[PDB]
Amino acid sequence: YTMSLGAENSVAYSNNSIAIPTNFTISVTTEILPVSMTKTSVDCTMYICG
Amino acid sequence: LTGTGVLTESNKKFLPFQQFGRDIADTTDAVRDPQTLEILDITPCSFGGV
Amino acid sequence: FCGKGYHLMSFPQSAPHGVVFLHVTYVPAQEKNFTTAPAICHDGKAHFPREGVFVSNGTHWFVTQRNFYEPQIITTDNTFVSGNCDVVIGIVNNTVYDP
Amino acid sequence: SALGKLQDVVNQNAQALNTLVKQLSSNFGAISSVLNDILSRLDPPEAEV
Amino acid sequence: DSTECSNLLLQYGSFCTQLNRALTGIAVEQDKNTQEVFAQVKQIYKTPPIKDFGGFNFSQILPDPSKPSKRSPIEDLLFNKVTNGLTVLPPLLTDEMIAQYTSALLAGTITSGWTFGAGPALQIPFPMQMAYRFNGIGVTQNVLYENQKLIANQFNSAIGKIQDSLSSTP
Numbered sequence: 001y002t003m004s005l006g007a008e009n010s011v012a013y014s015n016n017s018i019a020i021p022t023n024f025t026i027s028v029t030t031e032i033l034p035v036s037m038t039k040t041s042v043d044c045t046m047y048i049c050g
Numbered sequence: 051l052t053g054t055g056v057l058t059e060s061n062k063k064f065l066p067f068q069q070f071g072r073d074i075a076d077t078t079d080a081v082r083d084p085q086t087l088e089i090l091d092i093t094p095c096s097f098g099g100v
Numbered sequence: 101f102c103g104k105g106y107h108l109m110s111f112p113q114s115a116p117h118g119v120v121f122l123h124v125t126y127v128p129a130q131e132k133n134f135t136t137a138p139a140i141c142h143d144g145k146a147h148f149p150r151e152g153v154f155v156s157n158g159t160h161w162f163v164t165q166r167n168f169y170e171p172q173i174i175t176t177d178n179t180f181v182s183g184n185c186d187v188v189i190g191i192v193n194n195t196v197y198d199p
Numbered sequence: 200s201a202l203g204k205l206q207d208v209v210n211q212n213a214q215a216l217n218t219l220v221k222q223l224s225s226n227f228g229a230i231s232s233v234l235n236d237i238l239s240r241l242d243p244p245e246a247e248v
Numbered sequence: 249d250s251t252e253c254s255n256l257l258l259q260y261g262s263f264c265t266q267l268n269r270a271l272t273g274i275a276v277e278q279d280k281n282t283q284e285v286f287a288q289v290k291q292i293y294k295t296p297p298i299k300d301f302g303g304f305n306f307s308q309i310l311p312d313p314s315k316p317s318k319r320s321p322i323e324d325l326l327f328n329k330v331t332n333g334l335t336v337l338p339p340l341l342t343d344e345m346i347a348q349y350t351s352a353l354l355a356g357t358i359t360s361g362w363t364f365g366a367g368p369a370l371q372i373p374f375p376m377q378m379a380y381r382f383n384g385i386g387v388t389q390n391v392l393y394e395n396q397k398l399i400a401n402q403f404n405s406a407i408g409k410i411q412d413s414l415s416s417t418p
């Protein structure tokens with residue numbers, strides 16, 4: 001299929017209308033970030049020549 | 051087959067036709083010695099960085 | 101930068117070879133339509149909100165903070181005066197209560 | 200798949216190490232990929248090559 | 249197509265696998281980059297048919313319906329001014345899709361300010377949105393409301409100058 005970019009929304013804009021939230025939701029979301037790799041050391045002489 | 055290592059007893063169930071074992075690096079991991087036909091495990095001698 | 105929404109605080113959690121951030125954010129909900137005006141005309145003076153926004157529930161005009169509907173009576177304490185009513189486009193007529 | 204980034208880092212490091220290990224099994228045009236075989240089979244003039 | 253050459257290349261092991269893997273990593277990273285830059289909204293916003301934004305003119309940046317590509321005049325100018333076993337992989341997002349992302353972002357910021365970036369899109373008149381932004385930089389609302397025509401004219405002239413500067417600079 002041709003992928004959909006998102007749900008269609010037509011914001012009801014006019015020159016004298018505003019939307020004010022009457023409530024709220026406390027949202028908790030995760031963010032995963034790598035910090036370090038595995039510290040590997042390669043003995044070049046022993047790798048190449050044993 | 052020439053190499054260096056520590057030879058210990060092994061509990062790997064070698065089938066009768068199987069002679070030796072191999073790791074990913076293609077080095078010998080186990081061996082069946084002649085004149086005894088018993089399966090020997092080969093482990094590399096201790097090494098590391100100083 | 102710290103989650104989706106208006107960021108409140110974040111909590112760090114240790115992970116193998118990384119960190120996980122629990123981003124606590126404020127997300128507005130249950131919005132309502134209102135009629136709004138840039139300024140209120142009263143006694144030939146233009147009144148603008150100090151911190152909020154002028155909203156009308158259909159018949160009466162209030163001033164509420166912008167992120168949460170908390171309507172209040174338009175007074176001289178929550179509004180400031182700047183000029184007359186002949187300059188601002190869209191200024192509407194209503195009384196401004198004096199405490 | 201929630202922790203995909205850390206698992207991707209771990210997989211890439213382990214895969215690079217495994218590829219490096221597997222490269223020891225290639226002979227690169229030599230008669231054998233085992234140094235011990237070459238040393239126990241050839242004199243130094245050709246074993247050197 | 250040489251069989252002998254491939255037989256000799258088999259001696260070198262998995263070098264080709266490493267090269268292909270690295271190039272595949274780069275290729276998927278490009279699509280990921282485009283997703284992070286442009287796919288920041290899950291809602292495709294549209295501007296109202298009437299372009300009454302208190303005198304502010306966004307024609308040079310809003311999509312041109314007449315063009316087949318649905319690109320803005322500035323975007324059209326930008327796309328006009330930028331011109332053996334080797335394959336070029338097409339990007340995951342087409343130019344039309346990226347332009348639709350930019351149109352959604354423009355419609356969201358014009359019709360709802362910054363509210364759509366933190367939750368549901370809350371409509372606000374554009375002179376009042378710019379008055380909020382004036383408060384953000386330490387300038388009172390009345391400064392904007394009493395100078396709204398002048399600010400709109402300056403903004404329109406600045407956008408036109410942006411188009412002219414892009415067109416006339418190589």
Ligand SMILES: *[C@@H]1O[C@H](CO)[C@@H](O[C@@H]2O[C@H](CO)[C@@H](O)[C@H](O)[C@H]2NC(C)=O)[C@H](O)[C@H]1NC(C)=O
Nearest residue numbers: 010011012013017019020130131132133134296
């Ligand atoms: C505020 O009012 C507008 C119009 O009075 C509402 O917009 C309409 O919403 C319905 C329901 O989805 C749609 O079918 C119409 O097409 C919308 N009209 C326009 C012009 O966009 C809007 O939903 C109202 N907002 C709230 C929070 O009630």
Ligand SMILES: *[C@@H]1O[C@H](CO)[C@@H](O[C@@H]2O[C@H](CO)[C@@H](O)[C@H](O)[C@H]2NC(C)=O)[C@H](O)[C@H]1NC(C)=O
Nearest residue numbers: 021022023024025026027127128129130131169
């Ligand atoms: C604001 O939204 C919250 C939900 O986030 C509403 O709280 C719910 O209220 C109903 C009925 O009052 C209860 O059955 C739910 O259990 C409540 N949910 C939670 C999580 O407590 C709250 O009523 C809403 N307030 C307004 C003014 O709309």
Ligand SMILES: *[C@@H]1O[C@H](CO)[C@@H](O[C@@H]2O[C@H](CO)[C@@H](O)[C@H](O)[C@H]2NC(C)=O)[C@H](O)[C@H]1NC(C)=O
Nearest residue numbers: 155156157158159160161162163170171172173
């Ligand atoms: C807009 O809000 C005002 C104040 O909240 C409403 O005025 C009150 O309406 C109630 C309900 O009928 C009456 O009992 C009060 O006496 C009213 N107070 C005043 C000072 O008039 C008003 O009705 C609301 N308008 C709409 C259309 O909802």
Ligand SMILES: *[C@@H]1O[C@H](CO)[C@@H](O[C@@H]2O[C@H](CO)[C@@H](O)[C@H](O)[C@H]2NC(C)=O)[C@H](O)[C@H]1NC(C)=O
Nearest residue numbers: 140141142143144145185186190191192193194
């Ligand atoms: C807001 O109030 C002002 C003054 O109370 C109104 O201005 C008057 O308008 C009438 C007819 O439009 C004129 O005859 C008066 O001379 C005006 N007076 C002044 C002092 O300008 C204005 O029309 C009102 N606006 C609305 C929308 O009702």
Ligand SMILES: *[C@@H]1O[C@H](CO)[C@@H](O[C@@H]2O[C@H](CO)[C@@H](O)[C@H](O)[C@H]2NC(C)=O)[C@H](O)[C@H]1NC(C)=O
Nearest residue numbers: 299300301303304305306307308321404407408
């Ligand atoms: C917004 O700006 C555009 C272009 O800057 C205006 O379009 C011009 O309109 C005049 C007459 O209305 C024409 O002579 C020009 O040729 C148009 N230019 C282009 C590039 O189309 C437009 O009128 C402005 N105003 C509105 C409300 O859209």
Ligand SMILES: *[C@@H]1O[C@H](CO)[C@@H](O)[C@H](O)[C@H]1NC(C)=O
Nearest residue numbers: 069082083084085086087088
């Ligand atoms: C000699 O080697 C054979 C294997 O070829 C084995 O069967 C036999 O037991 C060995 N004899 C001695 C005396 O070790």
Ligand SMILES: *[C@@H]1O[C@H](CO)[C@@H](O)[C@H](O)[C@H]1NC(C)=O
Nearest residue numbers: 014015016189190191300302
């Ligand atoms: C909004 O537009 C209407 C026409 O649709 C006009 O009568 C009114 O004066 C406008 N208000 C503002 C504040 O521009």
